[PDB]
Amino acid sequence: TGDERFYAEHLMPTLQGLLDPESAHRLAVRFTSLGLLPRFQDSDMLEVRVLGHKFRNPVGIAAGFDKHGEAVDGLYKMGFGFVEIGSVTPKPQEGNPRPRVFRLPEDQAVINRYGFNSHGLSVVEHRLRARQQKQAKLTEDGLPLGVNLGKNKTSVDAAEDYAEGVRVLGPLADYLVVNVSSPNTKAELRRLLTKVLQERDGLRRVHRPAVLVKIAPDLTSQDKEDIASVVKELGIDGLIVTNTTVSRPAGLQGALRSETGGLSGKPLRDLSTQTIREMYALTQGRVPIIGVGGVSSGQDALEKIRAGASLVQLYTALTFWGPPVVGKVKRELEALLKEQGFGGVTDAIGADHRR
Ligand X SMILES: Cc1cc2nc3c(=O)[nH]c(=O)nc-3n(C[C@H](O)[C@H](O)[C@H](O)COP(=O)(O)O)c2cc1C
Ligand Y SMILES: O=C(O)c1cc(=O)[nH]c(=O)[nH]1
Binding partner of 115, given ligand A1AVV, ligand X, ligand Y, none, CB within 5-8 angstroms per partner class: ligand Y
Is residue 217 a contact partner of residue 268, using CB atoms and an 8 Å limit? yes
Is 310 annotated for ligand binding?
A: no
Q: What is the sign, positive or negative, of the torsion defined by CA atoms of 260, 266, 267, 268?
A: positive
- State in angstroms the smallest separation of the CB of 293 from ligand Y: 11
Going residue by residue from 11 to 50, which x/- string records binding to ligand A1AVV, judged by CB under 6 A? ----------x--xx--x--xx---xx-------------
* Helices 187-201, 221-234: crossing angle, 10 deg rounding: 30
243 is in an annotated binding site: yes
- Residue 9, Cβ density class (10 Å: 0-12 exposed, 13-18 middle, ≥19 buried): exposed
Establish if 295 lies at the interface with ligand X (CB under 6 A). yes
Work out what residue 32 binds among ligand A1AVV, ligand Y, ligand X, none; the CB cut-off runs from 5 to 8 Å by kind.
Answer: ligand A1AVV
Task: Give 214 or 257: the residue with its C-beta nearer to ligand X.
Answer: 214
- Measured CA to CA, the distance from residue 226 to residue 282 in angstroms comes to 10
Q: Is 272 a catalytic residue?
A: no
Q: Does 322 bind ligand A1AVV (CB under 6 A)?
A: yes
List Cβ neighbours of 36 (8 Å cut-off, separation of 6 or more): none
* CA 66 to mean position of chain CA atoms: 10
Which span (116-124, 186-194, 316-324, 343-351) binds ligand A1AVV, by CB under 6 A?
A: 316-324
- Choosing from 182, 272, 297, 310, the catalytic residue is 182
Shortest distance (Å) from residue 227 CB to ligand A1AVV: 28
Buried b (16+ CB within 10 A) or exposed e, 235-258: ebbbbbbbbbbeeeeeebebebbe
Residues that bind ligand A1AVV (CB under 6 A): 21, 24-25, 28, 31-32, 36-37, 65, 101, 110, 318-319, 322-323
